[PDB]
Amino acid sequence: MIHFILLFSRQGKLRLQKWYITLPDKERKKITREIVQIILSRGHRTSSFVDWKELKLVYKRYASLYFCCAIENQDNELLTLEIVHRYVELLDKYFGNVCELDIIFNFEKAYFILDEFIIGGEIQETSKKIAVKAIEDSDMLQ
């Protein structure tokens, strides 16, 4: 299960945050700052995997805004990257040419998509079209 997910920009600003572990607000802020510093202080050939606090911190940013995850040392490392890619593809399909501008203004939509996709740090829907259809149906309810 993913302990937490933090979508941070290249400048260090965070556009999304979803932690599945109940942590203090100050402790959560410190952890986010440390993760941003580690990711921002890492090269492009670091393997996209960092063992921070015994957590397989996987970073894979496809644009200026980066992505982070906190996977426990009990599952495969490529699974987190595949899940991140699937989530990015689903968000792009739901939004349509998703960019950094739409992420800040449409943070509620991204949060709803993440909630409908991954709940409690585990995967909720393996397919990419069923989740999109469910999100569209929920949005169309009003």
Binding site: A63, L91, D92, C99, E100
Partner: peptide, 10 residues
């Protein structure tokens, strides 16, 4: 800018 670019460009 660098923000208007698509995350995956699909």
């Amino acid at each position: 800018k660098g923000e208007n670019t698509s995350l995956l460009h699909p």
